[PDB]
Write an enzyme that holds these catalytic residues in place. Structure first.
Site, PDB file in Angstrom:
ATOM      1  N   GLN B   2       0.574  -0.729  -0.138  1.00  0.00           N
ATOM      2  CA  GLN B   2      -0.115  -0.107  -0.230  1.00  0.00           C
ATOM      3  C   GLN B   2       1.001   1.456   0.102  1.00  0.00           C
ATOM      4  O   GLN B   2       2.184   0.980   0.743  1.00  0.00           O
ATOM      5  CB  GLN B   2      -0.978   0.318   1.511  1.00  0.00           C
ATOM      6  CG  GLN B   2      -1.623   1.597   1.206  1.00  0.00           C
ATOM      7  CD  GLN B   2      -2.774   1.125   1.986  1.00  0.00           C
ATOM      8  OE1 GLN B   2      -3.636   1.201   2.355  1.00  0.00           O
ATOM      9  NE2 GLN B   2      -2.258   1.864   3.894  1.00  0.00           N
ATOM     10  N   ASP B  32     -20.368  13.308  -8.098  1.00  0.00           N
ATOM     11  CA  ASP B  32     -20.086  13.661  -9.167  1.00  0.00           C
ATOM     12  C   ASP B  32     -20.326  13.035 -10.281  1.00  0.00           C
ATOM     13  O   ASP B  32     -21.515  12.757 -10.599  1.00  0.00           O
ATOM     14  CB  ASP B  32     -18.337  13.102  -8.435  1.00  0.00           C
ATOM     15  CG  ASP B  32     -17.701  12.957  -9.370  1.00  0.00           C
ATOM     16  OD1 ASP B  32     -16.812  12.966 -10.118  1.00  0.00           O
ATOM     17  OD2 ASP B  32     -17.132  14.506  -8.602  1.00  0.00           O
ATOM     18  N   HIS B  64     -13.393   9.565 -12.822  1.00  0.00           N
ATOM     19  CA  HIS B  64     -13.409  11.152 -12.642  1.00  0.00           C
ATOM     20  C   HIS B  64     -13.494  10.671 -11.179  1.00  0.00           C
ATOM     21  O   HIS B  64     -12.911  10.897  -9.902  1.00  0.00           O
ATOM     22  CB  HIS B  64     -14.388  12.552 -12.790  1.00  0.00           C
ATOM     23  CG  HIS B  64     -13.580  14.022 -12.290  1.00  0.00           C
ATOM     24  ND1 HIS B  64     -14.777  14.340 -11.197  1.00  0.00           N
ATOM     25  CD2 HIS B  64     -12.803  14.490 -12.386  1.00  0.00           C
ATOM     26  CE1 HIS B  64     -14.443  15.513 -11.296  1.00  0.00           C
ATOM     27  NE2 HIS B  64     -13.094  15.594 -11.594  1.00  0.00           N
ATOM     28  N   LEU B  75      -9.588   3.041   0.803  1.00  0.00           N
ATOM     29  CA  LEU B  75      -9.133   1.722   2.574  1.00  0.00           C
ATOM     30  C   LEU B  75      -7.844   1.949   2.848  1.00  0.00           C
ATOM     31  O   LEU B  75      -7.301   2.228   1.889  1.00  0.00           O
ATOM     32  CB  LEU B  75      -9.217   0.502   1.739  1.00  0.00           C
ATOM     33  CG  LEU B  75     -11.224   0.191   1.100  1.00  0.00           C
ATOM     34  CD1 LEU B  75     -11.463  -1.351   2.327  1.00  0.00           C
ATOM     35  CD2 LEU B  75     -11.994   1.336   2.828  1.00  0.00           C
ATOM     36  N   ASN B  77      -5.530  -0.967   4.275  1.00  0.00           N
ATOM     37  CA  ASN B  77      -5.273  -2.548   4.143  1.00  0.00           C
ATOM     38  C   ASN B  77      -3.607  -1.555   3.712  1.00  0.00           C
ATOM     39  O   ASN B  77      -2.480  -1.502   4.395  1.00  0.00           O
ATOM     40  CB  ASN B  77      -6.135  -3.223   3.259  1.00  0.00           C
ATOM     41  CG  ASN B  77      -6.420  -1.668   1.949  1.00  0.00           C
ATOM     42  OD1 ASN B  77      -5.770  -1.220   1.625  1.00  0.00           O
ATOM     43  ND2 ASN B  77      -7.405  -2.054   1.346  1.00  0.00           N
ATOM     44  N   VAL B  81      -3.684   2.813  -2.484  1.00  0.00           N
ATOM     45  CA  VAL B  81      -3.583   4.245  -1.561  1.00  0.00           C
ATOM     46  C   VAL B  81      -4.074   3.997  -0.586  1.00  0.00           C
ATOM     47  O   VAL B  81      -4.572   2.967  -0.279  1.00  0.00           O
ATOM     48  CB  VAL B  81      -4.071   5.065  -2.863  1.00  0.00           C
ATOM     49  CG1 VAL B  81      -3.565   5.073  -3.927  1.00  0.00           C
ATOM     50  CG2 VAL B  81      -5.355   4.946  -2.848  1.00  0.00           C
ATOM     51  N   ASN B 155     -10.765  25.403 -12.497  1.00  0.00           N
ATOM     52  CA  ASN B 155      -9.131  24.932 -12.737  1.00  0.00           C
ATOM     53  C   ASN B 155      -8.808  26.724 -14.237  1.00  0.00           C
ATOM     54  O   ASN B 155      -8.136  25.997 -15.157  1.00  0.00           O
ATOM     55  CB  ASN B 155      -9.471  24.441 -13.888  1.00  0.00           C
ATOM     56  CG  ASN B 155      -9.190  22.870 -12.821  1.00  0.00           C
ATOM     57  OD1 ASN B 155      -8.334  23.327 -11.677  1.00  0.00           O
ATOM     58  ND2 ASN B 155      -9.699  21.567 -13.458  1.00  0.00           N
ATOM     59  N   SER B 221     -10.072  19.354  -8.137  1.00  0.00           N
ATOM     60  CA  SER B 221     -10.951  19.057  -8.600  1.00  0.00           C
ATOM     61  C   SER B 221     -10.158  17.444  -7.434  1.00  0.00           C
ATOM     62  O   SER B 221     -10.976  16.549  -6.669  1.00  0.00           O
ATOM     63  CB  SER B 221     -11.195  17.442  -9.392  1.00  0.00           C
ATOM     64  OG  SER B 221     -12.502  17.947 -10.775  1.00  0.00           O
TER      65      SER B 221
HETATM   66 CA   LIG Z   1      -5.917   0.572   0.699  1.00  0.00          CA
END
Ligand SMILES: [Ca+2]
Ligand SMILES: [Ca+2]
Ligand SMILES: [Ca+2]
Ligand SMILES: [Ca+2]
Lengths: 107, 275, 107, 275
Positions: B2, B32, B64, B75, B77, B81, B155, B221
């Site tokens: 991770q 979104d 997006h 998450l 774990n 990420v 933007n 964003s």
């Molecule tokens: Ca993760």
């Protein structure tokens, strides 16, 4: 005898070329609407409306796009009322550009 | 493994996660393009669609929205990420089509779903250059309702000394997020003007993508869900703080960067916000 | 997915504009030939032949034109193999230009 | 009234016309786009068409050919202009279409009509950049035959130190005419190179147009019928001079202008040629 013919390109990038064209069409309002434009009749109608002046295409008003920055470059080349054209613009993303005219950028 | 995107770090999130604050029990609505609910680094509580021709909130045909959602709760774990607020309850209010285009009344309608279903925080990483009485009324009622409201500054980089902040972030009732890099330099495309509240990491922000994918993106964003996940952690520490308290907290503990037309109050620091 | 679209103009004059366009067409070879070109299929075929390179269009060999000087300016703008284009040339008269490709200038 | 284009004057024609030399009894074939035979300032003896889809020699759908014809024999009355050789017998060998385009074999065929029908002078105000064995053979047989041969130098101005003289005027057997203004300045579009023989007035040369019209044109094309009408007057003075004598005469009495890659021998002077 409206001398009228445009071609439209669009690619990711901030400038003409150092930004390939990934899509390209042609439009012709003269005498009547035709070309490779999954929306000819409106575009003509669009330009007619604004009388061929890119720079004057009401954006959206009540449409929102995702606030991502994936710049897209729009080129337009040809004649309008046998008046030459060589416009190019950069929209922050591709939704922006689509919210731009009504149908010119219906692409 | 991770990995922790630099952005989660810029903002001091892990400091909070160290002390047990992971955004847990908090309801974040991401208005979104929907959210791939079938990605492994996300867990989606629920959601709804205002898109008439696109009615599954859990199918992100744009990506997006999935990207954004991941910046809030990816998450925690041993894969993917890490969201800013990893244990946060995530809701998919879809109001953006496959083309990322959504009518104001869809946006509006999405806000309304969130008020009624008691979200605590709302993230709107969307915007247009003109506003309206209804949209403004919309976010105004959220806030009266007690929802923290966050949204992308826009933007359109700079343009004279005129403001380039789009709606709904122009509205004073909405926290408006601009974007900085790993160097706290504002990204160039970032909107400016006096309606900007704070800045957050919004250049090459790596998050989750539809189909078990991960990738990096740029935009104001990507900055918002930083502030949104932010709001969320503070509520896991202090669950009966008003939105005003939480807002106030975020903006009074920023690290100040440049002049405020370009940076508002500066880069948020949730570590410093949670007190 | 050949990104292909051109537009062609022609007017008396020695330069782009300080020389109105009196005729204008669009051609598209991708996928197949179309456009406002009273000779699409050949032009595509032409460019294909020369593989999109104006500057390489065998003139005539066995065709003569009247030795009058009524200069005509040819503009071409678009993409070829998703490669941009912005060519313009001046022929001493209009017969010259017609003897130029085979069909590109079949106009 | 009748007017005398400056060009008829540049070349000293009127001097000859004063002494009774008007090109009379001489057969000039204008190979071209035909000639409006129905204009009042022209009188067309005869002619033929090599154009398969355009078979009336007397119908000039281009106007080109009519313009040229008028620079040779525009009649001498109280109307219009004045040809160089006003009493010259004019023939319309059409080998150019409405578009002014004609195949080499049409050109060739036209030359052949003229040899057999005993023209004395041939004007070819046409040209292409590449030549051929047949075309060359064509003009070569005219000359052996005794016809004076004249043709436009070309309109490709300059190009390095390379020659821009087109065919058939590149061929040494053909007199090749470049163009000057009322100031003896070469027109810019005028072809250069060592195959250029002489210069003549070819900028804004007013002649007859189809439909009883008169107008002005530019080109090496307008210069030739100056030399062609020229050849013609000399034969009205000396009807049993060979073409060689007539050629020789024209080129040895020129007023010298610039360097010969740009001007050959210079501006012809028929007054001086007829001796
Ligand atoms: Ca993760
Ligand atoms: Ca604001
Ligand atoms: Ca007359
Ligand atoms: Ca010669």
């Amino acid at each position: 005898y409206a001398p009228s013919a445009l071609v439209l390109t669009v690619g990711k990038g901030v400038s003409a070329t150092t930004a390939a064209p990934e899509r390209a069409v042609t439009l012709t309002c003269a005498p009547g609407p035709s070309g490779t434009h999954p929306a000819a009749g409106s575009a003509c109608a669009d330009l007619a409306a604004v009388g061929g002046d890119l720079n004057a295409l009401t954006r959206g008003e009540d449409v929102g796009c995702p606030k991502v920055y994936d710049p897209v470059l729009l080129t337009v080349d040809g004649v309008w009322q046998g008046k030459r054209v060589s416009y190019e613009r950069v929209f922050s993303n591709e939704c922006e550009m689509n919210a731009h005219g009504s149908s010119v950028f219906a692409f | 493994a991770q990995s922790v995107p630099y952005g989660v770090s810029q903002i001091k999130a892990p400091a909070l996660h160290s002390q047990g604050y992971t955004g847990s029990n908090v309801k974040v609505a991401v208005i979104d393009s929907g959210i791939d609910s079938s990605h492994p680094d996300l867990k989606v509580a629920g959601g709804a669609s205002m898109v008439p021709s696109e009615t599954n909130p859990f199918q992100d045909n744009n990506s997006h929205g999935t990207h954004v959602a991941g910046t809030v709760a990816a998450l925690n774990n041993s894969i993917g990420v890490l969201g800013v607020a990893p244990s946060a309850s995530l809701y998919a209010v879809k109001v953006l089509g496959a083309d990322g285009s959504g009518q104001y009344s869809w946006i509006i309608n999405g806000i309304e779903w969130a008020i009624a279903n008691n979200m605590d925080v709302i993230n709107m990483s969307l915007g247009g250059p003109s506003g309206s009485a209804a949209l403004k009324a919309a976010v105004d009622k959220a806030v009266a309702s007690g929802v923290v409201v966050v949204a992308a500054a826009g933007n359109e980089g700079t343009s004279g000394s005129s403001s380039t902040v789009g709606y709904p972030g122009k509205y004073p009732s909405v926290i408006a997020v601009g974007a900085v890099d790993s160097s706290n330099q504002r990204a160039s495309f970032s909107s400016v003007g006096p309606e900007l509240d704070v800045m957050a990491p919004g250049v090459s922000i790596q998050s989750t993508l539809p189909g078990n994918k991960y990738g990096a993106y740029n935009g104001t964003s990507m900055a918002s869900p930083h502030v949104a996940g932010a709001a969320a952690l503070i509520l896991s520490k202090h669950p009966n703080w008003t939105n005003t308290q939480v807002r106030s907290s975020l903006e009074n503990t920023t690290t100040k960067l440049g002049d405020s037309f370009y940076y508002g109050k500066g880069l948020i620091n949730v570590q410093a916000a949670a007190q």
